Amino acid sequence: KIEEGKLVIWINGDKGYNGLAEVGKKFEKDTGIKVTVEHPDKLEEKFPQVAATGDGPDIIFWAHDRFGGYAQSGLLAEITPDKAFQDKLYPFTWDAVRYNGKLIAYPIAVEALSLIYNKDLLPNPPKTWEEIPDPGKSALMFNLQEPYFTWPLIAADGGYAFKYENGKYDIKDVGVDNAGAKAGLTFLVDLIKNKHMNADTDYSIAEAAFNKGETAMTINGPWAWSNIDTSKVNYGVTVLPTFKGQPSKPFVGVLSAGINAASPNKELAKEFLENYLLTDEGLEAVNKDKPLGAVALKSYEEELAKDPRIAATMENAQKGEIMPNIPQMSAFWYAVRTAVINAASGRQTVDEALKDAQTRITK
Ligand SMILES: OC[C@H]1O[C@H](O[C@H]2[C@H](O)[C@@H](O)[C@@H](O)O[C@@H]2CO)[C@H](O)[C@@H](O)[C@@H]1O
16 A cells, blocks of 8 residues: 555564664654564565565565565565675675575575573583483473474485575475485474474474473574573573484575565665664664574674674584575475474374475475
8 A cells, every 4th residue: 555755664573673673763863764663474475465466565574585486476676785785794695685696685694593401401402312302291392383493303314405406406306205304204203202292382382381491492593592581591502403413404594684676665775774774783773682693794793703602503504504595495385384294293194294295396
């Protein structure tokens, strides 16, 4: 319903929207242009619905994987920073938001899942996945409803999204049905079957458990840290357990800011991002609300790199793989989500599930 003269930003609920709003207020003072920060439910799936008929927000925040599918539908505007601006952010972060030669977004931060453990309850964290299942429910709790959390275990011994080869992603070469993904999932289902974990554990349940001091371990991102801080739990962040000597390989996501192609405030959006958001102060404001992880801007990243928790995020990142941004990621996530959920709940076996996932992605 139009939108000229003001900015409407969409960012997920788990990130620093109040922090981003302080940035909005700084822009506002100087420019006179109102900045509105919203966090709707399932904005990543809702963007395409609204953006298609020239609606929605001016700017959108999300991990880079969804962006390539957005780019291909003609929903994003081309971002055009000069080469001097480009030199401020790490080159690999620019590579993430590069679709078909064109920059479709500004890189903000690098996110990776880590092992979060209660130091008072468990002073020394388990080095392997196989030493977790012990006698009773005594174990870890993490979101099992979102494929993003169980991925690290599945990829650990061989699973892969899309075969990466010669710069291209073999879309017809999906690897969720090999023996590495089958072992990862069988291990997870065995945890559930042997009752050390519940199949309905979601984000909120898992978070509550750890913040209330009911669980000694959990798996989460840099955005989770704020909640644990206020909860007063003595926690440490470290590397993901190994599975059969192989490190867990988490999917590396780059929080990105894309600009709607229907937005009449294209230059206002551009000015907010380069002059206000992507500065030391800009990123500091958002980081205070809920941590971002490893930031794209070198200057602020250099200060942030000595923090022990960021160090662990990075180690997990370099042992993982950057997510593909192509348009086949959307269907990839539904296939894996359905596969993990079915298998854990007893709808079908590990072999049945994964085969179906493969088949639906390779169609
Ligand atoms: O579970 C699949 C889901 O994974 C990623 O979503 C992450 C997101 O990037 C993180 O920043 C954080 O919000 O949590 C999400 C997990 O619920 C992908 O970005 C997303 O496309 C995909 O659906």
